[PDB]
Amino acid sequence: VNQNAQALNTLVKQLSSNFGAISSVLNDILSRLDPPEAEVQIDRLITGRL
Amino acid sequence: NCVADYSVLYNSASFSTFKCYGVSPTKLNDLCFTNVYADSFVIRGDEVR
Amino acid sequence: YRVVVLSFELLHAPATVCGPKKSTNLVKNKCVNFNFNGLTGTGVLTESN
Fold it and tell me: What is the separation, in whole angstroms, between the first and last Cα of chain A?
């Protein structure tokens, strides 16, 4: 249970990590930018999250 | 302490440039900021870059 | 050439400088889009404890 809970809790915490994007919340990238600038920023979060 | 319709600046033909570095400019009409700070000055053209 | 630099303080804290958005009545206990002070998403809104 501890190994699964440490594996899930780290997987969840990593949603909040930047990977070099202007925000670790996707709706902040979408609200502050147009698509030509968003695809440079979202690909950071995809490359990281994945 | 105010409401900022950025389109008033963004549609203005007076500007030689409208550079943005953490947003794309139409979104300035949708966002909300805790403060804005306007640094203001006059400079030669070959160093506006 | 006149230059002005508009530095922004993002929503780390209670927001003030808003975009010209006609705000609305608030739904509860139903699935809705939301925009509070530019903090957008989708969810079900309820009274807290």
Answer: 24
Cα–Cα distance, A5 to B16 (Å, whole number): 56
Other Cβ atoms within 10 Å of A1 Cβ, number: 5
Name the token pair of C37.
């002070």
Distance CA A47, CA B32 (A): 29
The b/e string for A9-21 (b: 16+ C-beta within 10 A; e otherwise) is eeeeeeeeeeeeb
Please tell me what resolution, in angstroms, this structure has: 3.7
Q: How was this structure determined?
A: cryo-EM
The minimal CB distance from C15 to the residues B3, B29, B33 is found for B33
The CA distance from A10 to the nearest CA of chain C, in Å, is 24
**What is the dihedral sign for C-alpha B26, C33, C11, A10?**
negative
